[PDB]
Amino acid sequence: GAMAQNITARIGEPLVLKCKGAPKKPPQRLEWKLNTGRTEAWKVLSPQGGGPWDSVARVLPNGSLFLPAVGIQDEGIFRCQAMNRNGKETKSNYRVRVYQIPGKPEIVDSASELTAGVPNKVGTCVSEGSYPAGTLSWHLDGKPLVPNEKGVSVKEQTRRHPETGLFTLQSELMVTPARGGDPRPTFSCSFSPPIQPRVWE
Template identity: 75%
Template sequence: KQTRSTYQVRVYQIPGKPEIVDPASELMAGVPNKVGTGLAKGGYPAGTLNWHLDGKPLIPDGKGVSVQEETRRHPETGLFTLQSELMVTPARGGAPHPTFSCSFSPGLPRRQALHTTPIQLSVWEPVPLEVQLVVEPEGGTVAPGGTVTLTCETPAQSSLQIHWIKDGVPLPLTPNPVLLLSEVRPQDQGTYSCVATHPSHGPQESRAVSVHIIGSLEGQGLGTVALALGILGGLGMAALLIGAIIWQRQRRQGEERKTPENQEEEEEEREELNQSEEPEAAEGSAAGP
């Protein structure tokens, strides 16, 4: 008998030197920045990519350092392509010129890691964003029904989003550097401030200004008093008028009652006179010739 032996031959291909593609030109302190993407091709089996800062391993922590990795395998050759994107947030006041590099460790035994060419970047500190709130008329004092204009002034209006706050509560308004209060009412009084948000600076709030209506409270008090006096005066006039009408009606009714009584008294007096005249006439006729 002839025995056939099957041997499986696995070919290991040494990967080429890794590289950093799409590197950044500079970094901004205090905000996340993309350093670049490490790339390694041709390794079999797949290895690992690791980042270094100033020659020391850079460990992702999910806060100041994050890495997004991707591994792809060619369907025909079985070779791998590894990618690793590095994001860092440089600390304010940290190293001004950090050096980054990426290394590829093959999955083969006794193979040394391969390193990319280091890149050195510059870190710049952003200038604090100054936000100023201007109010017109000056001082924020206006008469009832007047107009108040609040303007949020910043160094770069085009790249900012301006939001408004009244008495510590955000206003549900479309972002706009100008807030116009027309026909001011008592409910418009309060403390206003604006918040400017920039991708590289974060939110910055302006100083607060107050909007006050001249004589709003005094005017309301005087108006209330005047209204009360007017109501009382009207009620008094109405009472006098009703009293006069009732008095006139009672007077007329009294006169109407007195008229018949007077007529009866006059008739009685006439009858008495007639009766007294008749005896005198009879006596005169008897004393005649």
Template identity: 80%
Template sequence: MGDQNITARIGKPLVLNCKGAPKKPPQQLEWKLNTGRTEAWKVLSPQGDPWDSVARVLPNGSLLLPAVGIQDEGTFRCRATSRSGKETKSNYRVRVYQIPGKPEIVDPASELMAGVPNKVGTCVSEGGYPAGTLNWLLDGKTLIPDGKGVSVKEETKRHPKTGLFTLHSELMVTPARGGALHPTFSCSFTPGLPRRRALHTASIQLRVWSERRGGEGPNVGEHMSECMTLRKGRVQPVATGTTHR
């Protein structure tokens, strides 16, 4: 029988059912654990003592972990014999997770210069497990680093005591001459476990200047005649004239 995958939030209780076990004593069953807390298989039974505050067998044969932690990731197996003599095995593969705080963009740029590399900002996510990933978005679409116009410098740190992760992602872009004048950037955190929703930062909208900026206003070049429209409560540029891709 294959393992049943279980995900549990760090710090929350977890109950694993021992299938086929009689609901009341006397019971013939045995739990075996192989986790980050064990060097070999740890054996627990209804007749034995609980494992400190880590785990104990409940009266119905289920296994209770009062507050799961990163060290509890691993394999849990129960073998039970019913009163009629039928043996049933239960196998679980446990993984834990912690949802980090909402990611933030720190040290954001106030403006960008066309044709040269610019630092947009650094996206930071703190307190997650597993590590997960950070992604930058431009006008709602994921930015793919290409080493030319878009580059990302990433750093992952793990807290020595809690084991939780902090992620940093620094975005550098080189706006194209003749491109959008008011690009909107945001960042999202994608959890390391599936079926968990992504978390998003607030968006930042930056002004792009041409390289020949002078005086009090932008010099956007001869190919960039542009009018501004207001749509859905947000100012967006609408290019008139030559379209640049």
């Protein structure tokens, strides 16, 4: 694409995109063009507005584009072309990416006892409501736990809410604890955009 300013916009929150080089108030020779999940290629939006788009994105008196509540389908490219009073043309190019922050990750099915030297299901962690999906990771006593390295295995599941499109992640951790290891370890789960079992030697 072209050189653009990258914008991250939280779903459900308003977004104001500035049309650089536009006169401060009408009359303004400016045009907004957008290509998002809502459009077939480019859609042109004007200061006059009108129609269904007025519910989604409106040009403000200062020529900025206003979205009252951003959604997943507003991901895409937004462009303004304006002429000032001198006659100089100025372009504004935005690449808009949307996100949502999930609830705190929760442990839903933890083991109270592990046996050293064999594989053990440690627990299951769930994170609800992210966008984009993100990932869950496990930690042992503050250090990251790396799957497929050192008797650690992890299985993961992603589901989508059928109306909001937000993701739920579920992650299952299995470990083979090392002989003569910590008898009261602490496992934790974190989301990237406290399980304390007894270990039996």
